[PDB]
Amino acid sequence: NNSGRPLQETAPFGCKIEVEPLRASNCAYGHIPISIDIPDAAFVRSSESPTILEVSCTVADCIYSADFGGSLTLQYKADREGHCPVHSHSTTAVLKEA
Amino acid sequence: PTILEVSCTVADCIYSADFGGSLTLQYKADREGHCPVHSHSTTAVLKEATTHVTAVGSITLHFSTSSPQANFIVSLCGKKTTCNAECKPPADHIIGEP
């Protein structure tokens, strides 16, 4: 009668408590360090992937938020047709395309 | 083919036994041929020897260096250009190559 609320409705960080065995699934907190030894086959020499002669960036209207609300345009000059990866090294910016 | 004007742009480089350095030569020449590319430094060695040269374009090449920095002159059909870089320490510890 005086059991109160269960731990499913009070666990912080939105951790879904399940039984058999007792555990907490999808418990988001902190960061995990991961070291990955990528196979040597994946890598390719720079002479194969098209190196780009230069690039210019022009950022369109943007709003800082959770969704991919910001947009930009890259003017690129290169030498061959390929499949470049695009990344942001800043901690406070992420890209939709990789 | 005696090239008219060439310039050097160095990508990420690393000083190790393996060919862990890459660079690009943007060249403007007058004929299609087979220029021999070379390095005029005792602390840097290229991979390719003879490169197909066009009228105008770019060529990507590889090199290995022993200095912490790439401060070395590269020659293409006689024309010399100083490539300036800054090579990081090698990530590995041992190689099965000399």
B62: chain A residues, CB-CB within 8 Å: 45-47
What CATH architecture applies to the domain B3-86?
Answer: Sandwich (2.60)
Kindly tell me the number of DSSP H helices and DSSP E strands found in chain B: 0, 8
How far apart are alpha carbons B97 and B46 in whole angstroms?
16
**Which residues lie across from B72 on neighbouring strands?**
B83
How far apart are alpha carbons B21 and B58 in whole angstroms?
17
Place of tokens 């890459």: B22
Hey, is the C-beta of A45 within 8 angstroms of any chain B C-beta? yes
CB-based contact A51 B57, cutoff 8 Å:
no
A76: chain B residues, CB-CB within 8 Å: none
Both structure tokens of B78: 């006689």
Cβ(B65)–Cβ(B86) below 8 Å: no
Q: How far is A96 from chain B (nearest CA, A)?
A: 25
Q: What angle do CA B82, B83, B88 make, to 5 degrees?
A: 145
Q: Name residue B75's amino acid.
A: S
3-state secondary structure at position B1: coil
Both structure tokens of B54: 């066009």
How far apart are alpha carbons B70 and B64 in whole angstroms?
9
